[model samples]
Structures are given as C-alpha cells and as structure tokens.
Target: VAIVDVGITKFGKRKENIFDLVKEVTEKLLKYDIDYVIVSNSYSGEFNQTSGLSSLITTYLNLDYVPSLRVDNTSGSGGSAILVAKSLLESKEANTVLVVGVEKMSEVTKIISSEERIASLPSLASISAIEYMRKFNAPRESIAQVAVKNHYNGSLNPFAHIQKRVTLEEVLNSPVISEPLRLYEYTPISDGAAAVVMVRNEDALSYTSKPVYIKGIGSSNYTAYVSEKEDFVTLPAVVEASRKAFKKAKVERIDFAELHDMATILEIIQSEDIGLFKKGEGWKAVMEGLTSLDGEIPINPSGGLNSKGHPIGASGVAQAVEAFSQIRNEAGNRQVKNARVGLSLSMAGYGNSATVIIYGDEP
Candidate 1:
C-alpha cells in the first residue's frame, strides 16, 4: 500500500470540538473517492462522553454509507488504523482507504479509573528512567538532552504544540513530575487530528504525483503491566515490532525517524529497542547529538510526542504525516536533508505494545 496524501492539524490545546478537528484534516486530504474509513480514536467515549465515533465521523463527513470502523489502542491507535488500512487494501476489501486519527483531550478532566491510577503513565516511565540509568550508568544529562533536541526540532515545525527550544539545563531544572523526570520530559495533554489517503501501489500516482510507499509495517504486544516485565529497560514489543518491519522492508537503515516520545526515557528506550542504536546506548546517541535534526539518523524530526504534543490517537498518525512530508521533501524548515527512507514507531502504554512502519519514496 501507498500513502498518496496526508493532512494534520495544529497539535495543542484546541478550542474546537473533536468533530471539527477530524473534519479539518479530512477535508484537506479527502480528494479521492474513499472505499473505507478507519478512524483511530481512543478517548472519545471517556474524554468526550461520545461513542461510535466512526459512524459519527462518517455521518458528519457525508460519508455515512461508507463502511467505517474505529481502532482504539490508547496512544497506538493511529498505527493500528494504518496497519488495518493496509490489510484492507491488500485483501481487496477496499480500493482506497481514508484513515483519520483524532483525539480531543483538552476538555477532559478525568481519564483513568481509580484502580488503574496507582501506576500512572508518569510513574511508570519515571521508574523505567531511573532503572535504565542505574543499569547503564547513563548520565542524567543524556536523558535531558532528548527533550532539548526534540524541542529544537519542534521550534521548526509550525504545527507543533510547544514550538520553542529548551536548553538541557532548562529540562533538568524544570519542576519534577515523577522524581527524576521533569515537566519538560512529559508530553502535554493535547487535542489534534491527522488524516491520510492510502491506496494500492498501482493506484498511487493517480492520486498524487508524489506517493510514499509503505515498505513494511509491524505490530506487537507484550505484558500489559510494567511489573510483569523481565526488565524495566527493554521494551520487547518495540524490539520485536521493528524486527518484523525491517525484515519485511529488507533494509538495514533509514534516513530519519519519528519515535513515540511520550516521555524522554521512551525515546531513548524505543530507539535502542528498534536497533537504531546499540542496546543501552540510546542515551549516548542523544548526548552526542547523533539523533538531532542534522545528525546521523535525525530521529523525531517532527518534534515527536515530547515536543509535538501527544494527542493520544492522533500522535501516531501525525508521525506518518511527518514521514510523508519528509519523504516528499516538503517538511519546510524541519525537513531531513535527502530523506528517502523513514521509520515511525508508535507505542501503547508503557511498552505494552508497539507498531513500527517503514516508508520510502519508491515501492
């Protein structure tokens, strides 16, 4: 399958409703006839007290008759939707699929139930960060540098939530959220949406002059609770997902990547797990500037979730949108120079599951 077009909204605290956010991006990229609509959303029911979002979105778009479904995998919802779209096209169940990932989290007050609130996202990530540092003897600055680098990249992206650069000192000195992890290390509660048009390889050029092909995609899951893991540092799901994707792509490297940096530690952990860096060396990569926008691999050129804002379901789709932009050389100031192959990793929960997708300019 190939991505013929892509669209995304400004990711931040939005005043608009969820439907408006979805409509904005869908209208921007909905040129070709769509045989199927797959909506990636996780919190509409909890955040907006709304259910059956897929049907509601199609109805709002005057696509009520179009077959539609919603995929909810927490933060990884968008990646799941993309995988499903690819499968639909491959199975001949759909000719052209419209994938929209959306989340409206600004207005929400409550999310997790009391039982699940004991080990919150920040607590879980903070525990891993602490453990990783102890195991690898990684300096605190190395972890902080991930935020600094992503913030600098975000400064160049117009659609990013926090479009300003921060220094390592700033990141380190920021108020603590969960022990060592500071305020800047965590992704903000954001509201946004992203859309993409996917078609088979043969129908790609007919829709757009520049099409980014999905060379390979993979998804995997592991134990949901963090305590069940053998080790706190390694995200097995990410490792397995990337292994599957890279094996299918038959490629060893990529020019750039957009990783699910829900927290600074995740960026480092996922990069290492995906084989972008040697095991226990991802923090060193950040400290050495190897993952900067102009560095060796240029990970998170779109600012990632840390700086771009993680709008739950929309984040993974936005990563794909960023990859499409870079592969087409249309990412403006934040474009990775000579970017041909790009990778995106969307993770759910605290390393519970992950999806990796590789994209290239050619099929």
Candidate 2:
C-alpha cells in the first residue's frame, strides 16, 4: 500500500503537446514533497515507440538523481506504469514514487486521425465503439448514457476536465462521430495530464495518515480480434482479472469498485463480467440504481472517461487517483464514506489489456 497525492490540470486541451503537460504535472506533484516521478505520454510516439517523456519530465523537475523510468504497453501505458510503480513499492525497491500520465491528441487533425488511426486506438476506445455499433442498433445511446453519467459525476469532481453536466437526450443526440457513436458519447481528443505520488505503507507520513492500501491488482485480455474470440459480450478478461484481484485482496463485491466504464454500457456489463451481478443483468443493475454513487456498489463516481475527459495515457492513472483519494478520505465531495477498501479499474486497447488495482487504507 502507498499514499496517493493527486495533481491534475484544470481544463483539458487537445493539442498543447506533452512537454507542457509534463511540466505542469511535475510542478504540481512536487507541491506535496514528491521526490521522484514517472510521467506517461501517448500518441507522442515519434515512430520507434521511444516515448521517454517521463524521463524528460524527471530532468526538468530536477529529479535526475531520484530515478525515473519510461514505460508503454500501448495505450495501457499508464496502467502498466502504475503496475510497475506498484511492484516497486511491494518489492521494497523504493519508499516513494510519483506517477504522472498525460496525452496531447488534438495536435492531429480529424482527417488524419480517421485515416491514420493510432496503433493503440483499437485498444483504447475503438474496441467498445466497434462492438456497440455492431451489436446494438444505436450504439450512440450507450455511449451517451456513459457520457451523461460521468459528466454528472464529474460535476462533483473538482479536478475533472469536462465538468459540464449534460442531459441524456443531448448525449443521445450529439452528432454522430461513428456508427452508433455520438460526439458526447465518445471521449474527445483530450490534452491533459494527471499525477499521483506513491509511498510504501511503512513510510507513510502525516500527509497520508490514511493512505490507500494496494490490496489487490489484476489484468488480462482476450484475442487480438473480437471475431476471433469465442465470447465478445462476456469480457472474460475482466472476469479473470477481477477474480485474481479478489483472491489477492480477499474482498468481494461487498467492497466498493471504480470500474473502467469506457461507455455507459461498460459500467452496466461490468457487473456481470466482474461477478458483481448475475449474467446479462449488468446494465439492469445500473438501471435499477445498483451502480449509483449512493447505491449498494458505486462505479465511476468521478465520471469515468465520459465526463472526466480521457487523455488515454492519463486516463488509467487518473482512475488510480480516484481510488487512492477515496481510500484516504480525500475525495472531498465524491467521498465514498468510510471507504476502508477501494478498487481502480482501467482497461486499455479495447479488451486486449486491462488492469485492476485494489487498495485499502494505510496500515
């Protein structure tokens, strides 16, 4: 378990570039006595996938001696980077480590993005988008639901980028960017960054008197292509990951979770995949108010990607920040109330990769 200190840019930009984002995040993280950090950058891959923006950030922050590393597992880079930092803390490799995630996408035009889809696009949002259009007659509705929920949730999140709450009707009617996908439903090309400081439980200081504990973590995915997989709707990857995490944390649905609801439907379907609800009743559970902020089990109170603004690279780590904040009772208006245990769910490149992190109060 490690203490978490969150730092984020107020409003999201689409094309500001990663340098400034990293600089902003680094400055903020240091506000609370951060010594070392890991910054994440996506789509900044200048060919050869050699995106060491984190290291560059380290140098700029004057932390060249503390040690910082660059990591990228495609779009799940933030998730993977967090996992790396988690491992380091668990392995007693370091007492404090800061993780920063950011992305600049508006720099590229829509025309270019459409024709030159990112290599990690399929893993990030395209997978769910593709499924929605193919399965449901109106995929936009599903995405709209997600956007509405998240944005509404974001209204309570002071640090959320797109805090503008929208009506379900507006989401449903938002211009269609892709089949069954509406402008409000899908995350825009966001330019933003997020950061969090992690420190071992033993080293937890007064700043993190009730730090979030890393209870459990799990991650997995299905076949490369959806058609090649046997079950597209079930999301076996989620099941396996949650199962492993539950075993590690020794907790169940009785505990709270912050899921990766890339779309509104994802939050609903996650109930079934994660064994929180019966099969085929995932969406119903949400509709029935089982996934609300005050429900038996709440998901994405920070609005997830829909409302919070997904910087792809930073999205996953941002999820971790939410969980970490909740456990520390630092979520302010979005606090989950005496949350002894917290979980952060982040998926990447569609379902090809996902990461589940379980956290608890500092021991």
Candidate 3:
C-alpha cells in the first residue's frame, strides 16, 4: 500500500457540522480518483444515539454510488479504517482507496452524571497516571515535562490547536484535574478531519513522484472496563499492536513515532509499551528530552493530541498524515531529521483499542 496524497484541516474547534467536515475532507481526497471510500467516525450517533454519516458523507461528496464503510472504535476509528482499506487494496477489491477520518466534538458538552462522569475515559487515564507515578516512582515534574516538549513541538505546527509554546514551570503550575494530570496535560476538545489517498506501489508514481508506502499495520483490543485490568499503568494492546506491526515490517526500531497523547501520561506509557524504552522507565526519555524533534527518536513532532487537539476518529488518521509528511520530506519546520521509518499509534476508549501503522519512504 502506498500513500500518494493526504489532506488535513486545521485541528481545533469549528462551527461546521459533521456533514460540512465530510464535504471538506472528501473533496480533497477525490482528486486521486479513489476506487473505494472508507470512513472512520465515532459519536455522530451519540448526538442522537441513532444516525448515519457513512452514506451521508458519500452523498455529500457526490459519490453515493461508490461502496462506503464506517468504522467506530471510539477514538482509534481512523487507524482501524486504514487497516480495512489496506486489506481491501491488498485483496484487489479496490485499486485506489480514499480513507477519511473525521469528528465533530465542539458541540458536545461534559457529562454531569456522577457514575457516568466517574466512568469517563479521562477518569481511567487519571487512575493510570496516578498508578504509574506510584508504581514507577515517577515524578510530577517529569510528567509536566512531557507537555512542555509536546507544546513546543506544537508551537512549530501551523495546524496545531494550541500553537503557543509553554514553559515547564507554567505546566506544573496549571490547575490539577486529578493528581499528576493537569489541565495543560489533557488534549482539548476539537473538530477536524484527515484524509489519505492510498494505492499500490506498482502504480503509485502515476499519482505522485514521492510516495510513503505502508509497510505494516497492526491493531489490538484490550479490556474495556478499567476495573477488569491487572495493571493500570501499561497499555497491553499498544504493546501487542506495535509488536505485530514491527514484526510484519521486519524492523525492530522506529526512527520516530507519532503516539497517542490524549493525555500526557498516555505518551509516557505508550513509549515504553511500544518498546521505545523499557517498562517503568519511559518517563526518563521525556525528562532527558530524547523524544523532542531533534532528539534521537522524535515523538509527536506534530504535537500529537496534546497540542494538536484530539477530534476522536480524526486523530488516528492525522497521525498517519504526520508520518506520511515526515517520510515524504514534506513537513515544513516541524520535520524530523532523516525520517525513514515512521510509526503511528492511536488508542481508543481507555486503552480498549490500539492501532499501529509503519510507513516508509519505500515499500
């Protein structure tokens, strides 16, 4: 599988509805003459608990006759959609596939119910952060440093939601939501979409001279209920997902990674879960600044969900867009050096789902 073109809107709050975002992102992808359309979305139905945006997007794009499918993994929907696209392309079901990941979240408000609020995704992350700190002896300062680095990276990203650089002192001083997780450490509610045009390597050049090939893709799901888990600090799904992706790629090391940082602690846990660092030691990488843009293995140069904003399904595919841009040498000021092999990880619903993709300059 090869990526010839990618489209991404500025990630932040938008007044447009889901249909409008579909029109915006799908139009940008149609230029590739896509043979199949795969859509990744979550919670469009939650607004009504009964809805359909799959055919809606296709109709809005004037491609209602084409086969369209929607994927829902809460947050990792985009990555799962790409995996489906890759399968269709490999099976000769489609010659060219247009994958769109989108979400509209600005209209949704916070939950007020006590039980519902306690069971929310952020609550799980908060519990994990607290556990990790206690189990690994991780410092709050080290956790704050993760946001500082990502915010700095976001400052360089024109498409980021919060593009302003922040200081470590400022992050540490921010209001606490739960112990160790601050307001600044959490990703903001955002509305955005990302799209990618994929084709096989044999006919890749017909569309673009520079193509980022999809070398390997992997996905895994873990326990849905936080209470059912044995360890709160680690994401087992991420570990297994990256394992399959790397094994399929026949590469043990990734030059850079675009990880899910819906919250600061996710980044720390994922770094170790993906084998970038040892278990119980991922915090050291952030503190040492090894994951910065100029660092050995730059992580989240696109600012990740931290500063780039997390718009559910849009985030996973956006991570792929960042990897594609970096590998194609198209990312501007935030580009990573010698970015040959790029990895993207997206997690959904409190570590319940994980999608990992490895992209290379060549197949």
Candidate 4:
C-alpha cells in the first residue's frame, strides 16, 4: 500500500479549469484502480471553472461524492488543500485522497496579474509602507530591496518567475506597479498545476519507499488590510502559525527551512517573525549569502517565484514537490546537502488567506 502517489503536471500552454485538470488526473488514476480521490480549485473561479473540483474528481473517478468541498484560503490554497486531505485520512473519513492544486494566470499579463496577486498577498506593512511613502514623500526603498532580494534568490531557483538577479540598484530602478510594489517585486503571471495523493501510514510505501511525512503543520490569519493592522513590519499570521508549529514539532530556527518569499520582502519579514533569522537581519542574511545555496540554511533551491516563475495555486504544491525531492535526496544537483526537515509557506493579500506546512523525511 502506498501512503500517497505524488504527481505534478505543468503547462507552458493551455488555460485549463478544474474539470479539465480533473479529467487529466482521472485518466491517470483509472489505470491504477484508485478507490478514493480528492481535488481542489484555487486558480480559476466558477466564473470560468467547468465545475467544482472535488465533485468533478469524485464523479469522474466513479466514486460517490461525499463531503467533497473546495478548500480555499488565498495563495496558501495548495498547502491548505493538502492539510484537508491529510486530516480526512487521519480522521478515518477516507483511506486515500488525491490532492490537486492548479493555477492559470498567463491568461492575464503583468499589469492585471499584479492586481490578482495583491488580492492574495494581504499586504501588511506594505500598505503602511505605501502610506508612509505618501505621507513623508519618501521612496519605496524596502519594497525594491525586496524585489531585488527575490530576484537574486529567484536566480538560484529553477521554478522562479523572474530568474534574473536584479541588484538593489536595479530593484530600486523599477517603476512602481502599485504604490509600493514594483513590477520586479511581483510574481510573473503563469499557467500550470500539480497533484499529489495522501493516504495512511499503512499504505505509505505503496507510493514510494521514502514517503515524506507531516511532522508538523500550522497556519494563521490576521485582519485584512494594512489600515487594520496592528504592526506594519511583521506578519501576525506567520508569527502565530510558526509559533504553534515550532512548539508542536519541538523544532526551532536551527531546523532547516523555507519562507514564502512571495515578494522578497515576504521572505525577509516572515522569516524574521517566524524565527528563521533575527528581525532587521534577514536582509543582511541575504546580503551575506547566508541564505544562498552555499550558506548554512539555503532558502529556495528551486529558484522560487522570482526565478522559477509562479503559477499561483500550483506554487504551494510545487513547493511540496520540491520538499519531496529534498527528503528523498533526489533534488539533483540543487539538493540542499542533507535537508531532512522542510517548510512550505504562502501568504495572501487583500484580507484573503495564508498557510504553512512542515515536512520531514521518514527517518
């Protein structure tokens, strides 16, 4: 029995809805005689979606649709969807559940794409950063710093959106796309998707001899909008969620990890608040190459969103796929030496949603 069979599908072409992706996965699964399947929709909404993902997968796979629902919470949708799948089996509701996360943003370009991301980023201090700039006639330096850092980090990532390493000089040079965010700071609009299945421990090896396990999983959210924020420099969601995870897993900053880095600023802010590095120092960490591949704890080896290109909803599961590769010591040349434990994070803006998942090797 296999705990899960993880499969990822990406497209440089085609704008597909949930049903379309489901049909693809269904055809694949039918060959194996799957008894249970679960699907998620985070990219396309009903406006263009063929049908609900869970029901579509359920029906297409010839299983009775029971308690199937769309689990959404912004950019963290894939991680959140995985959490739901994990819970369903842990609770004995199902023996196996398939998790698929997809995104289709290439249909829109950078300008409009920025708006879509803003709706998910749930910008915290960024909004304040915007007002602070307008009120004092200051520059959007930090956001540019963020963009630059992400681009640098992205250059090291294979799946990044913008792989070119823009220096603080180049980043600061970018024209403002939003009040604070520059075009370079944003993830490029892309089209793609990914899928993975979850099952119990008894069924673990059926998928692979080295199945990654959920060592700890934590998530949180704050009041939407910067005006509603209590602080302008930190993510409450990242703090609280990380706190619970570190506590639950008996882990700390010493544990190798990854941050959202949705924007370079996100990696900086969230990494600090979540204890990956000291606050006001994450920037320095990046500068010193401490977060680089040769550094002690490399952040993104997949080139992340900046270099690897972000496919919105697929990004989360894609991160998981990266983690799976890490624990299996099969990330190829980019492998993080001996990375055993990992984290996948995503944040939503516009008062949307956020999620974090802790992954570990089987040991």
Compare the candidates by lDDT and give the number of the best one: 1
Candidate 3 structure quality by residue, lDDT tens digits, 1-363: 888898888888898888888787766667666778888888787433444577777778888678787888888898998999888888899999988899898991122322323366666677788888899999878888889999999999888889989998999888987766788999999999999989888888888888899889988998665454357788889999999999898888788999999889999999999989998899999888899999999999999899999999899989889998999888889999999999999888767889999999879
Q: Could you tell which candidate, 1 or 2, scores higher by TM-score?
A: 1
Clashes by residue pair, model 1: none
User: Using TM-score as the measure, which candidate wins?
Assistant: 1
Which 10 residues in a row give candidate 4 its minimum summed lDDT?
108-117
Better of 2 and 3 by TM-score: 3
- lDDT digits (tens) for residues 1-363 of candidate 2: 565576777446644567777778667566555555665656665634553555666676777667776666555667777878878877877667888888777661111221344333324344454654456443344445656667777899876767888988988777765545566765555678777788776666655556666777787865544443343456677788778888887876444677766555566556667778776555555556666677777778887776776777787777777777777667787777677777776765556677777777634
Which tens-of-lDDT digit does each residue in 143-237 have in candidate 1? 98999999999999999999989998999999999999999998999999999999999999998899999999989998775443257788899
Clashes of each: 0, 8, 0, 27
TM-scores, one per candidate: 0.95, 0.84, 0.94, 0.79
Candidate 4 lDDT for residue 11? 40
Question: For residue 34, what is the lDDT in candidate 4?
Answer: 50
TM-score of 3: 0.94
Stretches off by above 4 angstroms in model 2 are: 14-16, 31-36, 46-52, 108-144
Candidate ordering by TM-score (highest first): 1, 3, 2, 4
* Residues forming the 10-long window of minimal summed lDDT in candidate 1: 108-117
TM-score of 2: 0.84
Return whichever of 3 and 4 wins on lDDT: 3
Q: Report residue 1 deviation for candidate 1 (angstroms).
A: 0.6
